Amino acid sequence: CNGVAGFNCYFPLRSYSFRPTYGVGHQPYRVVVLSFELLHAPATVCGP
Amino acid sequence: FKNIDGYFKIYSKHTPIDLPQGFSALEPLVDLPIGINITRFQ
């Protein structure tokens, strides 16, 4: 594709274009993921 | 300086005065949970 768009040359990005007029199951969701590690270690982080 | 059980231990002492005479104990200063392997220093 020599670095130009065309047939079978699609940019692997797509936009969202969020608007307040969409349906309930369409607005973006802010997501976080917390991962722990249950092993034998100095155990730096501990709860209250 | 000591390194045991995944902890680095540093004891320290200061005095204003070849090594002198007398007795003076060293008080604990810092403990650190680093957990590395130590073989040489500089």
Q: Compute φ and ψ for B12, nearest 5 degrees.
A: -145, 160
Q: DSSP code of A12? A: S
Per DSSP, the three-state class of A25 is helix
- Elucidation technique: cryo-EM
Sheet containing B7-12: order of strands: B2-4, B7-12, B27-32
Q: b/e string for A3-37 if b means 16 or more Cβ within 10 A?
A: eeeeeeeeeeeeeeeeeeeeeeeeeeeeeeeeeee
Residue that the structure tokens 């940019």 belong to: A11
Q: Reported resolution in A? A: 3.1
Structure tokens at B11: 């004891």
Cβ contact (<8 Å) for B7 and A42? yes
Q: In terms of CA atoms, which chain A residue is nearest residue B5? A: A42
What is the Cα–Cα distance from B14 to A19, expressed in whole angstroms?
68
State the smallest CA–CA distance between residue B12 and chain A in angstroms.
24
Structure tokens at B21: 């005479």
Q: Is A44 on the interface with B (CB under 8 A)?
A: yes
Which amino acid is it at A10? Y
